[PDB]
């Protein structure tokens, strides 16, 4: 019936003075735009069909053509920024927001979906969707006593669109919009659908990616314990954004960091720091590095949880990117730690894998490591066990690598390495 029409045929039908002919052509357009293999989005745009689709959104008397055009427009907006813009330029934003109040759930859902694509394009369209007043009717769709009564697909789409309203960073979403969305977000974070949980976590990770005032808005909502729980989920699509959120949070103040420690996050890290997915190991190690950048009592918690052997482990063997984060974690630790904490690090076997990494062709990690060596020697000086440390480094081949780094391209590398030898070797 409406399968595989030409764009010419679609135009002919949409241009007829006949609502049913228009409906059939619009459905034909939706099927064209729904195919996986290279939908002719630009041809549809160039035919001038977007204003027609947008006007069909307003035809309350013909709910089928509202749905078909919403779907068609959704899929145009799912494309490039230029394609999303064409949709916005056709006046689609206020028309979709009006459709959020549709009596027909499949139509309001499609409107939710379309707005998600538009907002997902970037900060500007996100903020434009917010200015046209989308947040109130979106949240109203979720104002039910029990989220479980909503259709599953419907709830997932709403959650996904809300997360796009939270997404992107220059600038971040308006503070008032974030304040408005957060309580619904907190509630979605306690829902039992894995996709809803994933997208809720993504939203939270977006909101916590910024200055500490942004982090505080989220932390004040009391979500950290729920995030830590989700950190232990079996589903990788949930663990990943939960961990990003937790990692974001510990980039904050010592007090914000202490919240994730208090919530029991550290007991999950034996698994996270040995996780089969390299991205999880990397994010977990980055998170650890920011925890070792905290107070001495926070470093002590890392110790108590037995995580220093796991850091030695990752420094010893991991994807290089993960190893670099471990290097940071160690340099941070040795920077803020007590002498006893630093001694403990050495007794856990940090020196050999630390030295092994000095042969990396990455000048940044070298500077990081040399700094760590320095810090450990400073602690060893306060103990007068500098001799013992120098030997340890020599016995595992460290002195060789440090000797070589004296003739290094980078200024501060050459400097730091010579300084070490001229003071300890």
């Amino acid at each position: 019936g409406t399968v595989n029409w030409s764009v010419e045929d679609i135009v002919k039908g949409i241009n007829s003075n006949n609502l049913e002919s228009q409906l059939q052509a619009t459905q034909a357009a939706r099927k064209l735009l729904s195919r996986e293999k290279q939908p002719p989005i630009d041809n549809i745009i160039r035919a001038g069909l977007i204003p027609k689709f947008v006007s069909f959104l307003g035809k309350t008397d013909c709910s089928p053509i509202q749905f078909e055009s919403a779907w068609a427009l959704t899929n145009i907006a799912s494309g490039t920024s230029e394609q999303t813009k064409a949709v916005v330029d056709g006046g689609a934003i206020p028309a979709f927001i009006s459709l959020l109040a549709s009596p027909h759930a499949h139509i309001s859902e499609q409107a939710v979906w379309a707005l998600g694509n538009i907002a997902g394009d970037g900060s500007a369209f996100r903020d434009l969707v917010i200015k046209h007043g989308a947040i109130d009717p979106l949240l109203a769709l979720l104002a039910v006593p029990d989220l479980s009564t909503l259709a599953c697909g419907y709830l997932r789409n709403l959650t996904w669109t809300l997360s796009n309203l939270c997404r992107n960073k220059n600038p971040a979403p308006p503070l008032d919009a974030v304040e408005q969305i957060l309580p619904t977000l907190v509630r979605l974070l306690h829902h039992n659908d894995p996709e809803v949980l994933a997208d809720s976590c993504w939203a939270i990770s977006y909101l916590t990616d910024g200055p500490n005032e942004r982090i505080e808005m989220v932390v004040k909502k009391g979500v950290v314990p729920q995030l830590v729980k989700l950190l232990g989920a079996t589903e990788l699509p949930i663990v990943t954004p939960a961990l990003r959120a937790i990692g974001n949070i510990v980039t904050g103040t010592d007090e914000q960091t202490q919240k994730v420690i208090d919530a029991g996050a550290l007991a999950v890290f034996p698994s996270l720091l040995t996780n089969p997915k390299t991205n999880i190991q990397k994010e977990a190690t980055w998170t650890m590095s920011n925890i070792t950048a905290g107070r001495q009592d926070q470093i002590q918690q890392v110790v108590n949880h037995g995580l220093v052997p796991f850091l030695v482990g990752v420094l010893s063997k991991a994807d290089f990117k993960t190893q670099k984060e471990a290097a940071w974690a160690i340099t941070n630790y040795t920077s803020g730690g007590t002498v006893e904490q630093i001694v403990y690090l050495v007794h856990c076997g940090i020196i050999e894998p630390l030295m092994n990494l000095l042969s990396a062709k990455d000048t940044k990690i070298i500077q990081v490591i040399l700094d760590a060596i320095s810090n450990i020697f400073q602690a060893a000086e306060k103990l007068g066990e500098t001799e013992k440390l120098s030997i340890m480094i020599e016995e595992c081949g460290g002195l060789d690598k440090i000797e070589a780094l004296q003739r290094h391209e980078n200024e501060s590398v050459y400097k730091a390495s010579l300084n070490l030898i001229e003071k300890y070797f």
């Binding site: 980039t251 980055w286 590095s289 920011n290 950048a293 940071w328």
Partner: peptide, 6 residues
């Protein structure tokens, strides 16, 4: 201060 944002 030693913290590193994303």
């Amino acid at each position: 201060s030693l913290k590193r944002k994303r």
